[PDB]
């Protein structure tokens, strides 16, 4: 009954950021030390919460959200940020309590000639609300003429591939990101630290 | 390995219509677009048409607009080129091409590189 953090952090394939994965962690012992004692992460930022104090607390659910972005977008996975990722792909709330964890995945997610399998949303009629997930492929109406699902002048496909080549500069290399969210409901608290 | 296999080429009288097929096997999920190109002997290969795999919007070279139609059957992993009103000038080897690069602007598929290519099928338009 160890919490299955391995299934998120060590997944062979990650989600595109527009279609970010969420894992519900429940009814298990959360060994947070496996994460905070690791040398495997370059980003490990916890807002209004300490992963060492999490060991002493119980939650109804913990959520692990995971996806790939490029290195210079990791800064957008934070409260109060703007840019294509925070605006159109994955939005944290201003009052976020939880952890943002990231690591360079150039060895897994780049290939010679380009890995194009990871996409981002480039166009949207409004910014995402916090933890909103938009997987629509509706043609984006950039002007006054309705598209009727046909691409052309002012009528664009709303997604685009990252081009991940192993020789990309570090700012253009793929990073795997996991966001931990903590939830208390009117229900049993089933996710507890080892204490 | 991803394989592209064209079929349907042959001898046609001018003014007739012919459908080419290109069947794709191996990886499926990753396909962004499929294109048709053609090359006459001693001439440079040229873009004919592209189709976005999701959604199915098509982009055409000016020299085949109103005449050729590109279409695809996702379930059969196959792209088609319906070549109406055949001209002597359409005589060439027709090549299908596949890209996994999702581009927001459909017109990118007229000039961006394709990483997978078929062996080509010969179309000859007589009289
Ligand atoms: C991921 O796998 C490695 C072993 O390959 C292990 O050391 C690590 O603890 C795993 N991560 C989690 C969160 O279980």
């Amino acid at each position: 009954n160890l919490c299955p953090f391995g299934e998120v952090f060590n997944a062979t394939r990650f989600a595109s950021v527009y279609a970010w994965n969420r894992k519900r962690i429940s009814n298990c012992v959360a060994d947070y030390s496996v994460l905070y004692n690791s040398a495997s992460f370059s980003t490990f930022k916890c807002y209004g919460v300490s992963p060492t104090k999490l060991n002493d607390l119980c939650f109804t659910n913990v959520y692990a959200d995971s996806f790939v972005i490029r290195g210079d977008e990791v800064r957008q996975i934070a409260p109060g940020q703007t840019g294509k990722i925070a605006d159109y792909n994955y939005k944290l709330p201003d009052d976020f309590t939880g952890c943002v964890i990231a690591w360079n995945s150039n060895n897994l997610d780049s290939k010679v000639g380009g890995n194009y399998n990871y996409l981002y949303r480039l166009f949207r009629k409004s910014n995402l609300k916090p933890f909103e997930r938009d997987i629509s492929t509706e043609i984006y109406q950039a002007g006054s003429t309705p598209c009727n699902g046909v691409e052309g002048f002012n009528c664009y496909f709303p997604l685009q591939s990252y081009g991940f080549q192993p020789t990309n500069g570090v700012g253009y290399q793929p990073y795997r990101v996991v966001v931990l969210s903590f939830e208390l409901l009117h229900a049993p608290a089933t996710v507890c630290g080892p204490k | 390995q991803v394989q592209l296999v064209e079929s349907g080429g042959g001898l046609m009288q001018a003014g007739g219509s012919l459908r080419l097929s290109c069947a794709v096997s191996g990886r499926t999920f990753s396909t962004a677009a499929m294109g048709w190109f053609r090359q006459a002997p001693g001439k440079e290969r040229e873009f004919v048409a592209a189709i976005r795999w999701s959604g199915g919007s098509a982009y055409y070279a000016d020299s085949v607009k109103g005449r050729f139609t590109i279409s695809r059957d996702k379930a059969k992993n196959t792209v088609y080129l319906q070549m109406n009103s055949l001209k002597y000038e359409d005589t060439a080897v027709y090549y299908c091409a596949r890209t996994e690069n999702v581009r927001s602007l459909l017109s990118d598929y007229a000039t961006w590189p394709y990483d997978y290519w078929g062996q080509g099928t010969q179309v000859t338009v007589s009289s």
Side-chain angles (χ1 to χ4, degrees):
Chain A
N1 54 1
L2 198 85
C3 291
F5 284 129
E7 289 177 15
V8 179
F9 284 85
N10 288 328
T12 61
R13 194 196 290 271
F14 266 49
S16 288
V17 63
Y18 83 97
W20 50 268
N21 280 322
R22 170 162 286 184
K23 171 74 156 176
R24 175 189 177 205
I25 303 289
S26 54
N27 194 33
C28 56
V29 174
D31 186 10
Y32 296 103
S33 79
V34 176
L35 304 179
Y36 61 74
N37 285 342
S38 176
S40 300
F41 307 121
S42 47
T43 295
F44 206 132
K45 194 159 174 189
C46 299
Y47 299 85
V49 68
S50 187
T52 53
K53 299 298 124 194
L54 286 181
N55 291 328
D56 295 340
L57 294 178
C58 291
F59 299 95
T60 310
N61 297 296
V62 174
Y63 299 105
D65 303 335
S66 63
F67 51 84
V68 164
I69 56 182
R70 67 183 214 185
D72 63 15
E73 289 167 337
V74 170
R75 59 149 280 265
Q76 289 184 49
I77 315 303
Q81 299 308 292
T82 66
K84 268 159 43 218
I85 300 307
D87 292 349
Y88 294 169
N89 290 267
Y90 186 86
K91 181 60 173 177
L92 287 183
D94 294 345
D95 66 356
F96 182 58
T97 315
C99 298
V100 178
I101 302 159
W103 62 104
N104 183 296
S105 61
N106 202 43
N107 57 310
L108 305 171
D109 290 323
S110 297
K111 67 154 187 206
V112 174
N115 180 16
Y116 298 111
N117 293 168
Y118 292 102
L119 317 186
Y120 54 89
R121 189 173 299 281
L122 188 55
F123 295 109
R124 201 175 183 267
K125 288 194 269 178
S126 65
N127 295 346
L128 290 178
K129 294 180 67 177
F131 296 120
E132 192 177 2
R133 185 172 173 273
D134 185 352
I135 57 74
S136 57
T137 56
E138 170 192 27
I139 306 311
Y140 182 74
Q141 186 192 320
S144 55
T145 309
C147 298
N148 292 121
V150 175
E151 292 179 58
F153 195 59
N154 291 327
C155 286
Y156 307 131
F157 194 78
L159 305 185
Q160 183 152 272
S161 294
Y162 289 113
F164 291 132
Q165 297 182 72
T167 55
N168 286 0
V170 65
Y172 297 81
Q173 284 179 20
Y175 280 64
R176 282 175 181 211
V177 182
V178 178
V179 180
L180 301 182
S181 276
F182 301 86
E183 176 174 276
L184 293 167
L185 308 175
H186 193 75
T190 62
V191 181
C192 296
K195 286 152 202 154
Chain B
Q1 263 73 39
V2 181
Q3 311 288 4
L4 277 53
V5 179
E6 300 100 333
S7 57
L11 185 70
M12 291 296 299
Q13 286 208 103
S17 190
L18 179 60
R19 191 148 171 136
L20 307 186
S21 298
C22 169
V24 183
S25 47
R27 314 172 66 189
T28 292
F29 74 91
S30 49
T31 304
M34 298 292 301
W36 284 102
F37 291 75
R38 69 184 179 182
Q39 182 162 26
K43 283 199 161 170
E44 293 197 6
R45 182 197 75 198
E46 60 180 35
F47 172 76
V48 172
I51 188 160
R52 193 177 300 276
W53 200 248
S54 167
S57 286
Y59 195 80
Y60 294 99
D62 286 2
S63 61
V64 304
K65 278 181 163 190
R67 289 197 311 119
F68 290 10
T69 304
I70 188 171
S71 74
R72 59 95 180 79
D73 179 341
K74 279 160 76 119
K76 284 192 194 315
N77 282 305
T78 300
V79 64
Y80 301 109
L81 188 69
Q82 189 70 53
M83 306 186 302
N84 306 296
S85 305
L86 289 168
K87 302 179 139 143
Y88 174 65
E89 289 74 17
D90 296 321
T91 297
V93 182
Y94 287 72
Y95 296 92
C96 60
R98 177 178 174 272
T99 184
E100 300 183 0
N101 189 351
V102 180
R103 296 303 298 165
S104 177
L105 191 61
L106 194 70
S107 58
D108 287 357
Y109 293 124
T111 58
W112 278 59
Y114 292 71
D115 293 319
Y116 312 88
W117 288 86
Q119 290 276 316
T121 187
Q122 177 72 49
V123 176
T124 302
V125 182
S126 53
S127 272

